[PDB]
Amino acid sequence: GAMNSSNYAELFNNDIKLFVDDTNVYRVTVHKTFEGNVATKAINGCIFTLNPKTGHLFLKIIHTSVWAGQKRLSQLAKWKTAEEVSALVRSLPKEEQPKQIIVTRKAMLDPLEVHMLDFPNIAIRPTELRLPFSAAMSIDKLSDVVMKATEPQMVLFNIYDDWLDRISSYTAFSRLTLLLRALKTNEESAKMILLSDPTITIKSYHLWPSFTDEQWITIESQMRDLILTEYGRKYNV
Amino acid sequence: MNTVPFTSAPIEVTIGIDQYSFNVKENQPFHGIKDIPIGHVHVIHFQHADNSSMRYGYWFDCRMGNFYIQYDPKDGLYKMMEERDGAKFENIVHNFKERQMMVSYPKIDEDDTWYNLTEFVQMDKIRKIVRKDENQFSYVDSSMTTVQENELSDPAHSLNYTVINFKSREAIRPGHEMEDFLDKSYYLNTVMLQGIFKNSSNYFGELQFAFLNAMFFGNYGSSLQWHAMIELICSSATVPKHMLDKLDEILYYQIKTLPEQYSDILLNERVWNICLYSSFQKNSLHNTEKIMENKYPELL
Ligand SMILES: N[C@@H](CCO)c1cccc(Cl)c1
Ligand SMILES: N[C@@H](CCO)c1cccc(Cl)c1
């Protein structure tokens, strides 16, 4: 069934699974035309496919050329997501294929189930959680590779950096979701927090700064203040 | 005109013959039904006064044999049987007819309702859905499950309707996933019509038989199959023009005949709203949309 608060620790067991987020697959800018009408211009997107246990991220870059000459692009985007996820699974050795795929938005369920009919033993599940994966394009190195791409491309990351050397998957995922929630609620503040200290750098092969254990505690606290604050600034409390 | 004579009526029962029904009291002098129109299938069905649980009945065609009803006090139901001695059957029918112990199939000359509900239903196809090949008539009841239901437990007592599943390899061509799911023409025209049913008449036959088993027996898997076969047509962008026109007439008479107080269970809100208002064929079912809006505007 659905993934929710009550079966949360299932993400961190030894059954391979992946999250699939499609919120950045079809991205547009809306502008006025010379005639004074409105039109959209697509920009490159990405499928966000993440193993929450290992941190492995399969970032498929959706180049704008995908949409050329196509109609109903928001509906297509969900199938295109599903086509790419199924192609990924098919490309992995059997012992690496997921046993479950959890979609962040219910509208991906039918597109993915249809594309995965060849895999009856892979459960396709929704979730009741409001996960902040849409903010992945607030991670500079991810946004950069997406916007620079001149063709379809798959790029591999570990979104946990080397965190698992020191913390459990459960704690890595909780840190990730806090960072992403912060970035989604107030990107400017969030990014200020992460960089304010020029001495803490980001390794060329990492996405986030090389914080110590103690510095992560401080950072994590600062991001929770931000999220609570923006909740007051938004709701006036 | 043909006749279904009865050995007797030992238990109080509501008897139905097609869209009509009448009450027989316990041990009332009742010896069957006469003036049944030749040329159609028919169904004779039962609901005991003591246990409205289990509606049951018998699909039959008088052109295929001489059939009678005789109550079985061991199994506790009215059973259809065949009399192979034609002379003995005629004499027994003639005796009951002279003693006026039979009720008359109450058909008004101007009423084509039963024809319209059964236009494409053929006894030979019924007998393949309801497998019991030693008899020329077919037993159905409320509780019989369908083959598709059984996949999701006795196979001999199943309804072998054609399985229809929109999220199946049969329904979806590799590489046309989005195309074939959002437009089921491939699945309707190539897989089902050309492949399985062979023609639209056989398709409509099963569609009409499913509806009638849902209406007369409250057979839930039949209702599922009726809706699915409607939805497969409505969800196909490319349907022969003759099929759309006939579907509209088919469904019109089904909706017209449905008991008003059974619409809440027998009609699937989602399928009807999608079919009438969202699907490719939302403009193609004018008679059906008009009777549905005037009779069941709630459902919509
Ligand atoms: N089984 C017989 C009983 C007569 O011996 C039967 C045959 C024909 C019609 C009817 Cl009502 C019954
Ligand atoms: N309900 C009445 C007829 C009204 O149509 C009735 C009585 C006796 C036999 C049959 Cl089939 C029907």
Q: What is the DSSP string of A125-190?
A: E-B-S---GGGGGGSHHHHHHHHH-SS-EEEEEETTTTGGGTS-HHHHHHHHHHHHHHHHH-HHHH
Instruction: Give the closest residue to A24 by CA, choosing from A101, A96, A84, A89.
Output: A84
Bridge-based pairing state of the strands A17-21 and A45-50: antiparallel
Specify the DSSP class assigned to residue A85: H
Token pair belonging to B198: 């062979």
Instruction: Give the closest residue to A52 by CA, choosing from A10, A97, A83, A94.
Output: A10
Please list the residues that pair with B14 across neighbouring strands: B23, B47
- Domain range for B161 is 116-299
Q: Decide: residue A150, CB within 10 A, 0-12 exposed, 13-18 middle, 19+ buried.
A: exposed
A117, A118, A119, A124: best to mutate for the B interface, most B CBs within 10 A: A117
* Distance linking the first and last C-alpha atoms of chain B: 42
Residue B225 neighbours by CB distance under 10 Å: 28
Inter-chain residue contact A76 with B178, CB threshold 8 Å: yes
Amino acid at A74: S
Token pair belonging to A192: 């200020």
Token pair belonging to B141: 């009841």
Q: What does the alpha-carbon distance between residue A88 and residue A16 come to, in Å, rounded to a whole number?
A: 14
Instruction: Give the closest residue to B118 by CA, choosing from B290, B253, B286.
Output: B253
Please list the residues that pair with A21 across neighbouring strands: A48
Q: What does the alpha-carbon distance between residue B241 and residue B227 come to, in Å, rounded to a whole number?
A: 20
Residues 6 or more apart in contact with residue B283 via CB below 8 angstroms = none
Q: What does the alpha-carbon distance between residue A38 and residue A6 come to, in Å, rounded to a whole number?
A: 45
Instruction: Give Rg (Cα) of chain A.
Output: 19
Q: What does the alpha-carbon distance between residue B66 and residue B188 come to, in Å, rounded to a whole number?
A: 38
Q: What does the alpha-carbon distance between residue A199 and residue A163 come to, in Å, rounded to a whole number?
A: 19
Q: What does the alpha-carbon distance between residue A145 and residue A160 come to, in Å, rounded to a whole number?
A: 18
Query: Looking only at Cα atoms, what is the longest distance across chain A?
Result: 59
Q: Decide: residue B264, CB within 10 A, 0-12 exposed, 13-18 middle, 19+ buried.
A: exposed
Q: What does the alpha-carbon distance between residue A62 and residue A30 come to, in Å, rounded to a whole number?
A: 19
Residues 6 or more apart in contact with residue A171 via CB below 8 angstroms = A163
**CA-angle at B269, arms to B230 and B289, nearest 5°:** 60
To the nearest whole angstrom, how far is the Cα of A214 from the nearest Cα of chain B? 50
| Chain centroid to CA A160 | 12
- Residue with token string 């994966």: A133
Q: Which atom of ligand 2 has the smallest separation from the CA of B104? A: 9
Token pair belonging to A230: 């923006």
Chain A interface with B: residues with Cβ < 8 Å: 76, 79, 82-83, 110-111, 113-115, 117-118
Q: Decide: residue A230, CB within 10 A, 0-12 exposed, 13-18 middle, 19+ buried.
A: middle
Q: Which residues of A touch B169 (CB under 8 A)?
A: 117-118
The H or E element spanning position A231 is helix A213-235
Inter-chain residue contact B177 with A79, CB threshold 8 Å: yes
Specify the DSSP class assigned to residue B11: S
Instruction: Give the closest residue to B16 by CA, choosing from B41, B47, B37.
Output: B47
Specify the DSSP class assigned to residue B37: P
Instruction: Give Rg (Cα) of chain B.
Output: 20
Q: What does the alpha-carbon distance between residue A223 and residue A190 come to, in Å, rounded to a whole number?
A: 7
Residue B12 in contact with residue B26, Cβ under 8 Å?
A: yes
Residue B26 in contact with residue B10, Cβ under 8 Å?
A: yes
CATH 3.30.365.10 for domain A164-237: no
Q: What does the alpha-carbon distance between residue A2 and residue A16 come to, in Å, rounded to a whole number?
A: 17
CATH of A9-163, one of 3.40.190.10, 3.10.20.30, 3.30.420.230, 3.40.50.850: 3.30.420.230
Please list the residues that pair with B70 across neighbouring strands: B79
Residues 6 or more apart in contact with residue A224 via CB below 8 angstroms = A178
CATH code 1.20.80.40 region(s) in chain A? 164-237
**CA-angle at B250, arms to B246 and B255, nearest 5°:** 145
Instruction: Give the closest residue to B85 by CA, choosing from B66, B63, B62, B64.
Output: B66
Token pair belonging to B120: 């494409």
Q: What does the alpha-carbon distance between residue B150 and residue B143 come to, in Å, rounded to a whole number?
A: 12
Q: What does the alpha-carbon distance between residue B17 and residue B216 come to, in Å, rounded to a whole number?
A: 10
Inter-chain residue contact B177 with A110, CB threshold 8 Å: no
CATH code 3.30.420.230 region(s) in chain A? 9-163
Show contacts of A194-197: CB within 8 Å, 24+ apart: A194/A219
Q: Which residues of A touch B186 (CB under 8 A)?
A: none
A72, A74, A114: best to mutate for the B interface, most B CBs within 10 A: A114
Q: How far is the CA of B44 from the centre of ligand 1 (A)?
A: 17
What counts of helices (H) and strands (E) characterise chain B? 12, 10
Question: Left if phi > 0, otherwise alpha if psi is -120 to 50, otherwise beta: which for B156?
Answer: alpha
Inter-chain residue contact B172 with A114, CB threshold 8 Å: yes
Question: Left if phi > 0, otherwise alpha if psi is -120 to 50, otherwise beta: which for A236?
Answer: left
- Following DSSP, what letter does each residue of B127-169 receive, concatenated? HHHS--TTSSSEEEETTPPBHHHHH---GGG-B-PPP--TTST
Three-state DSSP state, A119:
coil
Q: Which residues of A touch B178 (CB under 8 A)?
A: 76, 79, 111, 114
Instruction: Give the closest residue to B251 by CA, choosing from B283, B297, B193, B211.
Output: B211
Which CATH number covers residue B202?
1.25.40.550
The H or E element spanning position A220 is helix A213-235
Specify the DSSP class assigned to residue A64: G
Q: Which residues of B touch A115 (CB under 8 A)?
A: 177
Q: What does the alpha-carbon distance between residue A201 and residue A204 come to, in Å, rounded to a whole number?
A: 9
Q: Is any ligand 2 atom within 6 A of the Cβ of residue B22?
A: yes
Residues 6 or more apart in contact with residue A62 via CB below 8 angstroms = A25, A26, A44, A45, A46, A47, A77, A80, A152
Amino acid at B208: Q
- Residue with token string 């097609």: B18
Resolution reading in Å: 1.6
Alpha helices in A68-168 (DSSP H): 73-91, 109-115, 140-148
Q: What does the alpha-carbon distance between residue A182 and residue A186 come to, in Å, rounded to a whole number?
A: 6
- Ligand 2 pocket mutation pick from B4, B6, B22 by most atoms within 8 angstroms of CB: B22
Residue B165 neighbours by CB distance under 10 Å: 14
Q: Decide: residue B172, CB within 10 A, 0-12 exposed, 13-18 middle, 19+ buried.
A: buried
Question: Left if phi > 0, otherwise alpha if psi is -120 to 50, otherwise beta: which for B292?
Answer: alpha
Q: Which atom of ligand 1 has the smallest separation from the CA of B7? A: 11
- Phi and psi of A4, rounded to 5°? -145, -170
